Symmetry: D3
Subunit: 102 residues, 6 copies
């Protein structure tokens, strides 16, 4: 109710087989640090592919595009990329878009 046209960002990552737990922790660090400290970050979910064990998705929702750009500039995402720099493939942006309200 009353959410407006929120900004949806879907990200895809692949990681080596021995980094599945490491990336899950890094993704949750990103989700929790972002949701705790960035008001414009409304939702941040880490999703594991049902069959592809090395593939992960981030389903992120922001108040608007400006809030996503602010997130991209903040400390949490910088630390996230420090954590995964040694192994992770990505980010591949599956899409960015606006919610159709109704």
């Amino acid at each position: 109710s009353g959410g407006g046209m929120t900004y949806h960002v879907l990200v895809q990552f692949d990681v080596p087989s021995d980094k599945r737990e490491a990336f899950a922790a890094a993704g949750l660090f990103d989700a929790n640090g972002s949701l705790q400290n960035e008001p414009g970050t409304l939702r941040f979910e880490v999703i594991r592919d049902e069959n592809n064990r090395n593939r992960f998705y981030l389903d992120e929702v922001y108040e608007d595009e400006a809030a996503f750009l602010q997130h991209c500039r903040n400390e949490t995402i910088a630390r996230f990329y420090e954590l995964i720099d040694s192994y992770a493939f990505g980010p591949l942006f599956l899409f960015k878009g606006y919610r159709v309200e109704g």
Copy 2:
């Protein structure tokens, strides 16, 4: 919890943008009203591609998605869009990581 996430992609002709958005919202609202296992259903338009839409669906488990698949709302949704829409293309199906 460890919910089941399904992301779908649809492409429509340029004169069917309003028609598909209404159909997708019908799908979202009808599913949330009639299906206890359907927890979240959002229609998303690509930020630049005006002919591409996404469905972001969340279910209790996979069984609830399969129930959605055999229910009345999705069948009516496809009767509405079959003549013009291109899809579904499943971008992924997956489970949420708890934490």
Copy 3:
């Protein structure tokens, strides 16, 4: 046996599903009958997307695929579908691993 496998993807309008199926079957049967290097040719429809079709082609070697590409059967195939079909999108080309 290190045969050459080519996988191709096509998208068609909703009212052209039967016409593309017929054109794809012509391509398969014409190529298998008239091209000694063409060993297998199947038309596959997507289980969920009623507008998406795949061609699964097997050749003696890569040279036999390039010959197919220069032959008359595929030319007639593209003549049939040119006004409506979207493609080809090659999903892969590769060699069978023997064993």
Copy 4:
């Protein structure tokens, strides 16, 4: 009208031979022991040396699900679990009869 499943895998450069053997194990074990499994081919990309494809044919969709809960595919995933990227399903579908 047979049921066709196309799967895609990526593997590290030093695991190409390991995956090919695992895919062939999957193919031969499935064809020998699963009456619903009709065809199973392992394909290497012509240029992408780390990318492989599985081209599988079943008598129907139920036979594919039966394959999916049998022993051979479980041993296949045991062989590749420590390195393989995938499965990515390129498509599942039915052959057009004719």
Copy 5:
């Protein structure tokens, strides 16, 4: 690194192949003549898919790309193609590796 490269993909109906080429050419020429930060803009047709086009664009930096996105040429390009073209789909954005 150096220059900022943007690769875009469009799909059009079979009867709009000439229209889109003219539109992409209008976009390319209008942007190169008029935008100093727009260094290269190429329209490319797929070698086999007659309905798929690619735009290969190079800018001085990302700001020059965002400026291009705000100019009148791209706005007119999208007015020309809005009724039929499918896109844009961004294949990638990146920086040239120097050397």
Copy 6:
């Protein structure tokens, strides 16, 4: 010949091989441009955000010039350099430039 042949290629590399691939891609670019008359342009591009992903933007006189490139020694050495780590090539497209 009024239509050049454009080939777009995509690679992924392990995180510790980014500099190695950049050097390998530049060897390929400079070796091809210096020794292949049919090779008109060859650029190595890194993804703006995907740090393990690279692209090759290649332009040839015609399709025959691309196939000749594929048979020459520069690309063979390129694949020797990257054999032990690189994922790819994935061809994003091959196509012809529109004139006007």
